[PDB]
Amino acid sequence: GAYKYIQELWRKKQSDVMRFLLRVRCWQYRQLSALHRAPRPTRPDKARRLGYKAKQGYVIYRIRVRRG
Amino acid sequence: GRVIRGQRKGAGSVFRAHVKHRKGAARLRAVDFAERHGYIKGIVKDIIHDPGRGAPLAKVVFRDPYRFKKRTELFIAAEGIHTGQFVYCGKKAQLNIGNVLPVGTMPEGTIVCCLEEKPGDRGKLARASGNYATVISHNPETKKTRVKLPSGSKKVISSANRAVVGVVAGGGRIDKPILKAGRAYHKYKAKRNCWPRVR
Amino acid sequence: VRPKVLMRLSKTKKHVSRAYGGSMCAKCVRDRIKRAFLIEEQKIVVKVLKAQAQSQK
Amino acid sequence: VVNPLFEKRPKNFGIGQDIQPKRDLTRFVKWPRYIRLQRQRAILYKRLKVPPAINQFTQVLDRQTATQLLKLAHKYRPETKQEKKQRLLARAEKKAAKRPPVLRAGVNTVTTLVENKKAQLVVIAHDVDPIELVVFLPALCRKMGVPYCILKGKARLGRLVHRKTCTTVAFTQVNSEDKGALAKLVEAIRTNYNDRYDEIRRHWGGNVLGPKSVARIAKLEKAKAKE
Amino acid sequence: KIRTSPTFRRPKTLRLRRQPKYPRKSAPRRNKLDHYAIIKFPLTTESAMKKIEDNNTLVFIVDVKANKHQIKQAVKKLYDIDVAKVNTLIRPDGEKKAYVRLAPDYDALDVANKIGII
RNA sequence: GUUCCGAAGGGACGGGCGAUGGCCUCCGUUGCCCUCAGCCGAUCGAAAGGGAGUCGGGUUCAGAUCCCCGAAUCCGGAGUG
RNA sequence: ACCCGGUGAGGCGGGGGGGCGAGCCGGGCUCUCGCUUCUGGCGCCAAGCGCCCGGCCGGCCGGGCGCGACCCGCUCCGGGG
Ligand SMILES: [Mg+2]
Ligand SMILES: [Mg+2]
Ligand SMILES: [Mg+2]
Ligand SMILES: [Mg+2]
Structure with missing residues (x-):
């Protein structure tokens, strides 16, 4: 299964690949608003192990919190 | 102790500016293609007085180059201007009182009013009655100009921001002594609530 | 008259027979x-002088 | 011969002279935030130094061979739901009175087939919107020795199956009449992808400036070249 | 196509009409302020008598919700008499006193005898 | 916070298409398309500011430019005008 | 990236093409410019040219597309960083 490979990918956050992904995604999220529905989870494996299913009735909201 | 008066002035309760009878913001026209490449002209329709400001304002009419309209604007009236006069706006308008053109084109030693401190700001510097700035020297590479401000300071300015030729009208206003507290009271009533100062 | 009264008036009592x-x-x-x-005459004159200068050059 | 009353009236669009015509302004419009964001995301992709593991998806299978790939895949389409209904009825009457080879869709199915070496070639869509779901798959395919190609369009790749989208498909078993065509496709694809993976893993991307910046640099370097 | 204006503006989409799959409430509300509950009873004071004898009017009191049009329609239906005009005032007690002037070809005194107030 | 980081308009002369009623004439209701379209920001804020158009005589116990009589006037509407 | 200013985010960067100069044997090269300055007037909703098409009877009536108004581009233009 690909979910395991995605799991080690996301555990290698300091790698240049994941660092590039995180930088680009953070820029885009910052450009968006503070509270908006995502069309689908960004981390499907993490969502699945947190209890998300690809069914009608599960929604995902991407939200931004001020730091400090 | 208590909050002091100079500390209360920043809350803006009774220390806001009295701005009902003011005629608008005195701003140069927005930069555009015509002003950046050639020029356009306008007729000086009115010369009016707004409360709280020493300099008079010139109400000028241009014609919109993109649709069938006429645009009205308010300039800080340079001294010597008059109604029925044509004022020219743009890069290559010739150099005479009332015109506005970038400071990088005018020769050194030029007297200027309503100087624009950053390009596009529509005039910020030397716009009080009788004040002016001087174009000291140019620098083509890096496109920068030295300007002497009415405070005696010298500043480096981008050579592509506009400026009105001439001195601001209404000069010599502070040479007349206010003879009485009534005159001072009326002077500051049209500006804000700060006059009767206590030691 | 007070401006909203001008609705009741006829056109002849509001304007005069002339341009503007x-x-x-x-x-x-x-x-x-x-x-x-x-002004239009002066513009014609300057145009013809410009054409004459172009012919001369 | 015609009316002298017909004359032309040229309109001079000089500075300040006349009102300009309504020309095209599509590159000066104030666009909505979503359009602006989606355009400058691509601009950012072209700016930044993209690591080779993400760069590798830009180098894509060419159109001319992709058409044979798709026409061969069109034979092994999985059954539509109505076709499955027909066959389920049909088995019902034949019981009341062999599994043809097909494509295997889904990143999970494809990756488990590849790591079991049950796959014969793998087609990967080039633009999965988290790239991380497929970014690891070319290297895995190389080490298992399975030929892989990168195809334009998850939409047209999932048009093979009868769904909206599909990330990867896998040829795992075909018929005799298509073994030769599959062999030709596999040899071409392995020459293009499998045998270059050193340069694929060491080929960075992006790092190209804007047209205005590169033009200004070109003018400056031309000046210094002349003198 | 081309864009002649530098402003993007929201395009005009299509808005369907309600096609409800069941009425929200089952039945229409019955008209409660009808011609019988709209006029309650007429005044029979000295002022009302003088008004009916002199001005050829009638005097009723009604609930505060009635319009002059509603009042005159109700008077026409209940007493089959034509009405010239209506003047209403909300009395300090709370009801709405209505002076109803009839068409000249009817007689207020005759209508009052017919109704029963005199 | 009140125009500031909004895809902030549900309007319109007219033209075309589609249906309808009325002596299917001509128009109207519309339904779709083409074309035209800055607003300074929803909304609240004055019984002394802005704001069309009613006056005279008589009448009660207590109401009158309000009722009765007589003279007016403004606004809106009107297929067939 | 991030920050500031302006606008109804209206002509930005290259390239072409054309005119005026300078100099070299009708030629290319570098540079430059592209139309508004005597007057308290007017200026929009295309003339013109070219290519198609339709309806009625060569004529009448009614449409469409392009040049006029150059092309290609990835940051709305500038200033910081
Ligand atoms: Mg005081
Ligand atoms: Mg008259
Ligand atoms: Mg109000
Ligand atoms: Mg009032």
């Missing part, structure tokens, strides 16, 4: 006519 009737006075009307005509 009831909106601009006769003196400035005639100066506008003269100015437009003489």
Whole structure:
């Protein structure tokens, strides 16, 4: 299964690949608003192990919190 | 102790500016293609007085180059201007009182009013009655100009921001002594609530 | 009259029979006519002088 | 011969002279935030130094061979739901009175087939919107020795199956009449992808400036070249 | 196509009409302020008598919700008499006193005898 | 916070298409398309500011430019005008 | 990236093409410019040219597309960083 490979990918956050992904995604999220529905989870494996299913009735909201 | 008066002035309760009878913001026209490449002209329709400001304002009419309209604007009236006069706006308008053109084109030693401190700001510097700035020297590479401000300071300015030729009208206003507290009271009533100062 | 009364009036009691009737006075009307005509004549003159100079050069 | 009353009236669009015509302004419009964001995301992709593991998806299978790939895949389409209904009825009457080879869709199915070496070639869509779901798959395919190609369009890749989208498909078993065509496709694809993976893993991307910046740099370097 | 204006503006989409799959409430509300509950009873004071004898009017009191049009329609239906005009005032007690002037070809005194107030 | 980081308009002369009623004439209701379209920001804020158009005589116990009589006037509407 | 200013985010960067100069044997090269300055007037909703098409009877009536108004581009233009 690909979910395991995605799991080690996301555990290698300091790698240049994941660092590039995180930088680009953070820029885009910052450009968006503070509270908006995502069309689908960004981390499907993490969502699945947190209890998300690809069914009608599960929604995902991407939200931004001020730091400090 | 208590909050002091100079500390209360920043809350803006009774220390806001009295701005009902003011005629608008005195701003140069927005930069555009015509002003950046050639020029356009306008007729000086009115010369009016707004409360709280020493300099008079010139109400000028241009014609919109993109649709069938006429645009009205308010300039800080340079001294010597008059109604029925044509004022020219743009890069290559010739150099005479009332015109506005970038400071990088005018020769050194030029007297200027309503100087624009950053390009596009529509005039910020030397716009009080009788004040002016001087174009000291140019620098083509890096496109920068030295300007002497009415405070005696010298500043480096981008050579592509506009400026009105001439001195601001209404000069010599502070040479007349206010003879009485009534005159001072009326002077500051049209500006804000700060006059009767206590030691 | 007070401005909202002008609805009841007829047109002849509101304007005069002339170009810019009831909106601009006769003196400035005639100066506008003269100015437009003489300006256009001067423009024709400068155009023909420009053409003559182009031919000369 | 015609009316002298017909004359032309040229209109001079000089500075200040006349009102300009309504020309095209599509590159000066104030666009909505979503359009602006989605355009400058691509601009950012072209700016930044993209690591080779993400760069590798830009180098894509060419159109001319992709058409044979798709026409061969069109034979092994999985059954539509109505076709499955027909066959389920049909088995019902034949019981009341062999599994043809097909494509295997889904990143999970494809990756488990590849790591079991049950796959014969793998087609990967080039633009999965988290790239991380497929970014690891070319290297895995190389080490298992399975030929892989990168195809334009998850939409047209999932048009093979009868769904909206599909990330990867896998040829795992075909018929005799298509073994030769599959062999030709596999040899071409392995020459293009499998045998270059050193340069694929060491080929960075992006790092190209804007047209205005590169033009200004070109003018400056031309000046210094002349003198 | 081309864009001649530098402003993007929201395009005009299509808005369907309600096609409800069941009425929200089952039945229409019965008209409660009808011609019988709209006029309650007429005044029979000395002022009302003088008004009916002199001005050829009638005097009723009604609930505060009635319009002059509603009042005159109700008077026409209940007493089959034509009405010239209506003047209403909300009395300090709370009801709405209505002076209803009839068409000249009817007689207020006759209508009052018919109704029963005199 | 009140125009500031909004895809902030549900309007319109007209033209075309589609249906309808009325002596299917001509128009109207519309339904779709083409074309035209800055607003300074929803909304609240004055019984002394802005704001069309009613006056005279008589009448009660207590109401009158309000009721009765007589003279007016404004606004809106009107297929067939 | 991030920050500031302006606008109804209206002509930005290259390239072409054309005119005026300078100099070299009708030629290319570098540079430059592209139309508004005597007057308190007017200026929009295309003339013109070219290519198609339709309806009625060569004529009448009614449409469409392009040049006029150059092309290609990835940051709305500038200033910081
Ligand atoms: Mg005080
Ligand atoms: Mg008259
Ligand atoms: Mg109100
Ligand atoms: Mg009032």
